[PDB]
Amino acid sequence: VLYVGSKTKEGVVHDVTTVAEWTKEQVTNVGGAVVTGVTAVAQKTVEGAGSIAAATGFVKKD
Amino acid sequence: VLYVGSKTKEGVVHDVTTVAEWTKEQVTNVGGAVVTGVTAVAQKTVEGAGSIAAATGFVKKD
Amino acid sequence: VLYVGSKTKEGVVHDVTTVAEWTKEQVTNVGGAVVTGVTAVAQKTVEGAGSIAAATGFVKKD
Amino acid sequence: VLYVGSKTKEGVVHDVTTVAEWTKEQVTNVGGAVVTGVTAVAQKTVEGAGSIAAATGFVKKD
Amino acid sequence: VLYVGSKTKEGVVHDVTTVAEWTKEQVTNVGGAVVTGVTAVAQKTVEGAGSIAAATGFVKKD
Amino acid sequence: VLYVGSKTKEGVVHDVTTVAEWTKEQVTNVGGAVVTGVTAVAQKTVEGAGSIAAATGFVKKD
């Protein structure tokens, strides 16, 4: 293995653009997740049993 | 392995752009997560059983 | 392994841009997480059982 | 005339993005203009006879 | 005329982004202009006869 | 005229970003202008006959 002037992009997130304008937003909740923003998870490796990698809006009610 | 003038980007997040303008936002809650912003997790390695890597808006009610 | 004029970016977050303008935001809460800002976690390694790496908006009610 | 939370953009230039990569470029010249970069003129008012407002790559050989 | 929380942008230039990477560039010249960079002129008013406002790469050989 | 919490930007230049990386650049010249950098002129008023406001890479060989 050998490079020159190279580039590598394993596991990234880029150029996420959100624009809200005149936004009215009621939200109620009782006991459960609610998500409204912009989530950005970026991982390279995840290992192991029973794992939960990069959850968003989760409820685990065993 | 050997490089020259190189670049590597394992596990990153970049150029996240949020724009809110005239935003009205009520939020109530009882006992459960609520997320509205902009989350940015960036990990390289995660190992081990039972793990929960990079959760956002989570409820674990065993 | 040997480099020249090189660059490595394992596990980073950069160029997060938030813009709020005329933002009205009520928030109530009872007993549960609420998140509204901009979170920026950046880790290289995480190991071990039962771990919870980089949580944001979490509730663990065993 | 009266505003609120307003915005005006008379005569601007913004978000000019140039990207060159592995560019070989010979250029000769004798006695005449040559332009290769990125020009950005932004004017509001220009008045008067015979004027030459915002020239780029000009030759006036009277 | 009267404002509140306002903004005005008469005659500006902003967010000019240039990126060169592995650029080889020969240039010869004899007696005439040559331009290669990034020019940024930003004027509000220019008046008067015979004027030459914001020239770039000009030759006036009367 | 009267403001509150206001902003005015007559005649500006801002956020000019240049990035060169591994740049080889020969340049010869005889008797004529040559420009390679990043010029940033920002004027409010210019008046008068025969004027030359904000020239860059000019040759006036009368």
From Swiss-Prot, chains A, B, C, D, E, F:
<feature type="binding site">
    <location>
        <position position="14"/>
    </location>
    <ligand>
        <name>Cu cation</name>
    </ligand>
</feature>
<comment type="subunit">
    <text>Soluble monomer. Homotetramer. A dynamic intracellular population of tetramers and monomers coexists normally and the tetramer plays an essential role in maintaining homeostasis. Interacts with UCHL1. Interacts with phospholipase D and histones. Interacts (via N-terminus) with synphilin-1/SNCAIP; this interaction promotes formation of SNCA inclusions in the cytoplasm. Interacts with CALM1. Interacts with STXBP1; this interaction controls SNCA self-replicating aggregation. Interacts with SNARE components VAMP2 and SNAP25; these interactions allows SNARE complex assembly and integrity.</text>
</comment>
<feature type="modified residue" description="Phosphoserine">
    <location>
        <position position="51"/>
    </location>
</feature>
<feature type="repeat" description="3; approximate">
    <location>
        <begin position="6"/>
        <end position="20"/>
    </location>
</feature>
<comment type="similarity">
    <text>Belongs to the synuclein family.</text>
</comment>
<feature type="region of interest" description="4 X 11 AA tandem repeats of [EGS]-K-T-K-[EQ]-[GQ]-V-X(4)">
    <location>
        <begin position="1"/>
        <end position="31"/>
    </location>
</feature>
<feature type="repeat" description="4">
    <location>
        <begin position="21"/>
        <end position="31"/>
    </location>
</feature>
<comment type="function">
    <text>Neuronal protein that plays several roles in synaptic activity such as regulation of synaptic vesicle trafficking and subsequent neurotransmitter release. Participates as a monomer in synaptic vesicle exocytosis by enhancing vesicle priming, fusion and dilation of exocytotic fusion pores. Mechanistically, acts by increasing local Ca(2+) release from microdomains which is essential for the enhancement of ATP-induced exocytosis.</text>
</comment>
<protein>
    <recommendedName>
        <fullName>Alpha-synuclein</fullName>
    </recommendedName>
</protein>
